[PDB]
Design a protein around this ligand. Structure first.
Ligand SMILES: [Zn+2]
Lengths: 54, 70, 277, 49, 272, 51, 48, 191, 94, 287
């Protein structure tokens, strides 16, 4: 049930973006959305935190 | 009711305002601004914002939604 | 039969507070929920309470209802002691107005098919700045009735009007596909007193004294400002009466604030000296 | 999944205790309030928020 | 129910009253409103303790605002012509927390102190016109004020000149309608002077109220008797023949014409 | 007092009303229509109001 | 379409490069020929 | 036979008694598993909840149509404290009243091996009250029989009244196997 | 025991209390303040001690009856001042 | 431990509605629910709640049927709707506690280690908040007295999200007070302060009466706090204080005098203008 809910919430139309900077406090992100925008994420999200190099 | 209206005006002069450059004064209680968003608007000035100080090309906070100079 | 421009949706205090909380607790994602309520006879839609829906990611639509969650929590609310039908749905529009878009129209059509009285309510948390609740109820106009020349809603009374429709709703088709229902609020006296408890002042703050150094500083500052305004008002009266307002008005405001503050603190000091011995 | 990200910006002017001019990167300039527990004096002109 | 109440108005027939009670004892707005109003018409003036008890109990126990409105007017009619015997019920209704029942209290004041200029009732209505929170109850209070003062037409304009210049549109409409009721079929001059600026207002229903009140006042009046009747006839024609004039303003103008030329210029409106 | 309160309320309404764009008139093509370029986005042909 | 994300065999999950606006990860919809997509084929994409 | 049952279980210290191999605790675990499975197999629409009788009564599982959760929550029940039979039974009655499905018979099977220290008067009053609310309190006695057998007879006789086969008493002084004694018992026989 | 009205303890008082001549009441009070038993100061020029605190302890039923009496008085004074203010300002209370 | 708990208007309204619906369907002295919130240091934020089915024997005083399964199901669905709201306690709408409160708090401690009771009195009072907070602490009494698992009071407050402030203000728009100190309202606030002080002193005096006669035992923390209060009472007959008091009163009164003088001069100017205007109008009418 939990995995199905995650799959439903990960609807395809993602916004391709960078991971320009990676921080810790858990981990965070300073992602650079391809809409020439910068968004800090306090929680990285569904990604596996596979070291997400800048 | 007069006190309530005063408080409402003081409130609409709120915190999350948007910066912009007052470009000139068209008439009384109305003027043209250019918001840092990059767009120019014909907005309404609130009352008693020291129109003496309100000189062309002046930094001013704008209502986030109505863009009114407040 | 024809629904008249007199029906009202009575949104309870709890329903409204839950709506606003959910909207601002899930902005910008379009939050949605159901309305545990009751159609009474023909003019009443009593939204006793609301019922949040889990964020489904795929915006707001019938796909986001998640019927299993609906049924489970409705059954358990009935167990709790809250046996109400689902009189329509609510969903937020965070900052881009209070109306219906195409998907909203489709969802509300489905709800009407379930029961042809359900009302679709929209709350805009972004522009719901404190002091102004931008909420609005709606129902769809059948495609046949409008073309038949008949008005979408009967008009048997003056109630229902007195509401100015929004320009945004007009440009998005307020009266061409749906129509705005009047929202009334059912406020109980006990609920209002509980609400007052929010900012109700404490007897401490009632009987407490302002810092005396700060009070003296404020009195000195305001008296100097009132001095300057006195000079201005003297020159103003002299010039106006020799050639025949802001100074007088500002001076009145300063005198009022001075009197109220000084009298309040003097009386508070008197009361303290008496009461605390 | 219910953690909306913030917008990175820079402080500029240090207005009254509860007011800060912040320029959002690739965006406009706002006057904003500061979160109560965030504590202050750690937001000087140029500070990233 | 409406027809039977009209036919039996004032008779206080027990059988009719009980049938109307049975018809009211349901949950349906359309039937309940008429049933309550007809109950009031039938029991009018009787001061029947049973009637007051039953109507107030059903009003408190029901759930339909339309039935509540019907019962409000019904109670008001029931407690008619009783100057001081209505005061207990008036106090109860005024202190009641249901806004429709507070409106019923205003109407009870009006009907009880109808055409007596009672200063106690005038004070109560004027107090409620500014203290109460429900604009409906404020408007009902002003209307009741007019109902009280209709016997001295010159007196009411003094009261209503200030109310007409109120920032509350509901109170303004109540002022207009109170002037209309008070100076109905009298063609007073200061009343028309007050109504005309109100006829020119930015609010929707204030204009309707002003137009209908002017028609009430000038019903059966000639140009020489009142040198403004032709002006208001032109005003009604203009507002009817208009592009942006509001629906309710046009409704008020059309009614105003109907009342002004009521009965083919053969009937006037006088409460006494 | 009524005048003061009404003035404040009307100011509130007229100030919470939405703002307005400023554009440069390229040409008053046709009656009741005006080709106007609004900075910085493209240029429209606006339908002028009746005032 | 600048990258078909390898097509992951099934579940294509195409990528698109809406110029002056943004990059996106999207899919087909009623595309009667899911094979005639290629890379850099200048596909048409909805708004919402 | 649509049924709603509450299995009361004693976890007092006297369950440290090891007459039933390997222990009274494991014996009662096996018996409750067997009885719950027997109730569930017959008309699976039946629902079963579980109560722990300790220093203070507790309800581990409300009326559910599943049995694995009840087994899992009972497995961690350890011997502690002392039995409070009256409070346990009252909690069981409350759970029956609150059961979601009102179309079920009301049963309470109580593993009550312990010396029931309660007053006889209030005891009979409770039994009669339960009879009035139409409850069937089956009682499994394994332990201080010499002490509690007369009181359990009072339970069942008062509940039955006349021809009232709803409530039953099964006493097992011998300890060959509690599970086998329960399976070869009148209570489970009718299912 | 001493009320806040006249908590000005004197050297002679402390002498008549626990037996010491008035040349070390000073040291005794110093020890009390340092340990934290009481708070205040010692004006030995005027030969008195100002106490503005005491470490609270556990009390007796009579020691609590005394507190009850003191409260009774305080409640009476508060009620009287309340009535006075309410009656005086009756015409402006909201 | 938790030093503060701030309940929210949504929680208050939900509790009131729960009690109303339960007392409409049937009759019960209390209704019970779970309080959901978040921690920020030792400051609990009770931002939501939900009712749970619960009934008890008011005679036995030890038999109740709080529904743990219902609790966990509702908690899971509320987690699905919102995640930063974990079970932080429970509430019951009873003006007074009961012997079952400790047992139910023991039950709730399985879902939260720092489980806090919040009694939300539906009956509306006029001096204090409608919420009383309690934390179950069981420790060897340094007093040396027998120790029993009992509650301990927790400071409580009412706070609101901004999205709840908007709704609260809208609902109270008709009966709201001005958010400014108008002299009449300030005097009224002082009178209400005197009222509250008198009520609190009366409560303390009644408790002292009861403990002195013997009905209740001597609570050492209560007596310590009362001792500290009486230590803290000021001395207003002190000459050095009377002189400063008169000095400050005279300063305030001179400011008030200047203010009143200015106000009177302004009023005279206004009347001069009015007399001149009336003169002009009557002259113009005559001519
Ligand atoms: Zn929508």
């Amino acid at each position: 049930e939990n995995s199905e809910k995650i799959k439903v919430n990960k609807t395809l139309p993602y916004l391709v973006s960078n991971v320009i900077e990676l921080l810790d406090v858990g981990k965070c992100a300073v992602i650079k959305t391809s809409t020439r925008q910068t968004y800090f994420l306090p929680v990285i999200g569904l990604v596996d935190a596979e070291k997400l190099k800048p | 009711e007069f006190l309530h209206a005063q408080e409402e005006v003081k409130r609409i002069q709120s915190i999350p305002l948007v910066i912009g450059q007052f470009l000139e004064a068209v008439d009384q209680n109305t003027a043209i601004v250019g918001s840092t968003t990059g767009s120019n608007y014909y907005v309404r000035i609130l009352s008693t914002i020291d129109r003496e100080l309100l000189k062309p090309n002046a930094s001013v906070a704008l209502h986030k939604h109505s863009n009114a100079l407040v | 039969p024809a629904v008249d421009t007199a029906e009202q949706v009575y949104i309870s205090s709890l329903a409204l507070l839950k709506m606003l909380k959910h909207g601002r607790a899930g902005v910008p994602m379009e939050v949605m929920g159901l309305m545990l309520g009751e159609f009474v006879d023909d003019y009443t839609v009593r939204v006793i309470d609301v019922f949040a829906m889990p964020q489904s990611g795929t915006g707001v639509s019938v796909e986001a209802v998640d019927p299993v969650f609906q049924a489970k929590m409705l059954d358990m609310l009935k167990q709790t002691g809250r046996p109400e039908m689902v009189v329509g749905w609510y969903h937020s529009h965070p900052g881009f107005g209070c109306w219906l878009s195409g998907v909203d129209i489709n969802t509300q059509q489905s709800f009407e098919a379930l029961s042809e009285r359900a009302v679709a309510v929209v709350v805009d948390p972004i522009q719901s700045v404190k002091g102004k609740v931008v909420i609005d109820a709606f129902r769809l106009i059948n495609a046949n009735m409008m073309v038949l020349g008949h008005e979408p809603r009967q008009t048997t009374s003056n109630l229902g009007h007195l509401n100015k429709p929004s320009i945004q709703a007009l440009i998005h088709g307020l009266n061409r596909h749906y129509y705005s229902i009047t929202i009334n609020y059912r406020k109980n006296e006990l609920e209002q007193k509980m609400l007052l408890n929010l900012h109700k002042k404490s007897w401490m703050e009632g009987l407490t004294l302002q810092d005396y150094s700060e009070h003296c500083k404020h009195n000195e500052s305001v008296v100097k400002e009132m001095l300057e305004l006195a000079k201005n008002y003297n020159k103003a009266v002299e010039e106006e009466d020799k050639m025949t307002q802001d100074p007088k008005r500002h001076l009145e405001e300063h005198v009022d604030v001075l009197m109220t503050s000084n009298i309040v603190q003097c009386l508070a000091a008197m009361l303290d000296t008496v009461v605390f011995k | 999944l219910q953690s909306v990200g913030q917008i990175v910006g820079e402080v500029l002017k240090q207005l009254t205790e509860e007011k800060f001019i912040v320029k959002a990167t690739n965006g406009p300039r706002y006057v904003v309030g500061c979160r109560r527990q965030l504590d202050k004096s750690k937001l000087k002109p140029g500070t990233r928020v | 129910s409406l027809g039977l109440g009209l036919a039996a108005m004032g008779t206080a027939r027990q059988d009719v009253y009980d049938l109307l009670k049975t018809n009211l004892y349901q949950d349906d707005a359309v039937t309940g409103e008429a049933a309550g109003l007809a109950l009031g018409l039938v029991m009018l003036g009787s001061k029947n303790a049973q009637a007051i008890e039953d109507m107030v109990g059903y009003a408190q126990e029901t759930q339909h605002e339309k039935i509540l409105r019907g019962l409000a007017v019904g109670i008001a009619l029931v407690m008619y012509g009783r100057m001081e015997e209505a005061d207990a019920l008036i106090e109860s209704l005024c202190r009641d927390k249901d806004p429709i029942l507070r409106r019923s209290g205003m109407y009870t004041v009006a009907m009880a102190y109808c055409g007596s200029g009672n200063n106690k009732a005038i004070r109560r209505l004027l107090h409620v016109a500014v203290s109460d929170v429900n604009d409906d109850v404020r408007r009902a209070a002003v209307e009741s004020l007019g109902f009280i003062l209709f016997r001295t037409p010159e007196q009411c304009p003094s009261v209503v000149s200030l109310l007409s210049e109120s920032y509350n549109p509901h109170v303004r409409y109540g002022a207009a309608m109170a002037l209309g009721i008070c100076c109905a079929g009298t063609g007073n001059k200061e009343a028309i002077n007050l109504l005309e600026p109100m006829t020119n207002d930015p609010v929707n229903y204030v204009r309707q109220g002003a137009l209908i009140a002017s028609a009430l006042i000038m019903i059966q009046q000639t140009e020489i008797t009142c040198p403004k009747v032709n002006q208001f006839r032109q005003l009604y024609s203009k507002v009817i023949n208009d592009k942006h004039d509001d629906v309710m303003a046009k409704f008020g103008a059309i009614l105003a014409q109907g009342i002004l030329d009521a009965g083919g210029h053969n009937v006037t409106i006088s409460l006494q | 007092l009524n005048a003061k309160v009404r003035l404040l309320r009307e100011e509130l309404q007229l100030l919470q009303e939405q703002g307005s764009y400023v554009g440069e008139v390229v040409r008053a093509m046709d009656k009741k229509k005006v080709l106007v370029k609004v900075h910085p986005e493209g240029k429209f042909v606006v339908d002028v109001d009746k005032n | 379409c600048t990258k078909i994300i390898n097509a992951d065999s099934e579940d294509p999950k195409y990528i698109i490069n809406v110029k002056q606006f943004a990059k996106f990860v999207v899919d087909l919809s009623d595309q009667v020929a899911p094979t005639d997509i290629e890379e850099g084929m200048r596909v048409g994409v909805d708004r919402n | 036979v649509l049924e709603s049952t509450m299995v009361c279980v004693d976890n007092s210290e006297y369950m440290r008694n090891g007459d039933f191999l390997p222990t009274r605790l494991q014996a009662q675990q096996d018996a409750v598993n067997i009885v719950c499975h027997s109730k569930t197999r017959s008309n699976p629409e039946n629902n079963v909840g579980l109560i722990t009788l300790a220093n203070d009564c507790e309800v581990l599982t409300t009326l559910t149509p599943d049995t694995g959760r009840i087994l899992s929550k009972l497995h961690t029940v350890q011997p502690k404290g002392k039995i409070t039979f009256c409070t346990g039974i009252r909690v069981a009655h409350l759970a029956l009243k609150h059961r979601q499905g009102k179309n079920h018979k009301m049963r309470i099977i109580a593993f009550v091996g312990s010396p029931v220290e309660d007053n006889e008067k209030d005891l009979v009053k409770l039994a009669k009250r339960l009879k009035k609310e139409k409850v069937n309190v089956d009682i499994i006695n394994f332990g201080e029989e010499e002490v509690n057998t007369e009181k359990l007879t009072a339970f069942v006789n008062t509940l039955n009244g006349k021809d009232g086969t709803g409530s039953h008493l099964v006493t097992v002084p011998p300890g060959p196997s509690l599970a086998d004694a329960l399976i070869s018992s009148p209570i489970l026989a009718g299912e | 025991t001493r009320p806040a009205n006249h908590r000005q303890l004197t050297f002679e008082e402390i002498a008549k209390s626990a037996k010491i001549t008035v040349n070390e009441v000073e040291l005794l009070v110093m020890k009390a303040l340092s340990v934290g038993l009481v708070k205040g100061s010692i004006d030995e020029v005027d030969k008195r001690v100002h106490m503005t605190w005491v470490q609270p302890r556990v009390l007796d039923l009579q020691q609590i009856k005394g507190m009850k009496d003191r409260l009774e008085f305080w409640c009476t004074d508060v009620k009287s001042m309340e009535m006075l203010v309410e009656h005086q300002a009756h015409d402006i209370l909201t | 431990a938790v030093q503060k708990v701030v309940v929210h208007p949504l929680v208050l309204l939900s509790v009131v509605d729960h009690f109303n619906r339960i007392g409409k369907v049937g009759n019960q002295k209390r209704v019970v629910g779970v309080l959901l919130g978040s921690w920020q240091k030792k400051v609990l934020d009770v931002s939501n709640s939900f009712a749970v089915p619960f009934d008890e024997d008011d005679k036995d005083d030890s038999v109740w049927f709080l529904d743990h399964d219902y609790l966990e199901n509702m908690y899971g669905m509320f987690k699905k709707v919102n995640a930063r709201e974990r079970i932080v306690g429970w509430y019951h709408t009873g003006p007074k506690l009961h012997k079952n409160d400790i047992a139910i708090n023991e039950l709730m401690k399985r879902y939260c280690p720092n489980s806090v009771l919040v009694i939300i009195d539906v009956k509306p009072k006029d001096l204090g908040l409608p919420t009383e907070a309690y934390i179950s602490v069981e420790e060897v009494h340094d007093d040396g007295t027998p120790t029993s698992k009992t509650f301990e009071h927790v400071t409580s407050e009412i706070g609101a999200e901004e999205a709840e402030e908007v709704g609260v203000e809208h609902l109270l728009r008709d009966i709201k007070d001005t958010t400014v100190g108008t002299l009449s309202q300030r005097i009224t606030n002082q009178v209400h302060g005197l009222k509250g002080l008198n009520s609190k002193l009366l409560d303390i005096r009644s408790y002292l009466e009861k403990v002195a006669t013997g009905k209740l035992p001597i609570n050492h923390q209560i007596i310590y706090q009362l001792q500290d209060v009486f230590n803290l009472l000021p001395d207003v007959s002190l000459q050095e204080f009377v002189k400063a008091f008169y000095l400050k009163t005279n300063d305030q009164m001179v400011v008030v005098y200047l203010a009143s003088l200015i106000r009177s001069v302004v009023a005279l100017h206004n009347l001069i203008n009015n007399k001149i205007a009336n003169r002009d109008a009557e002259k113009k009418e005559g001519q």
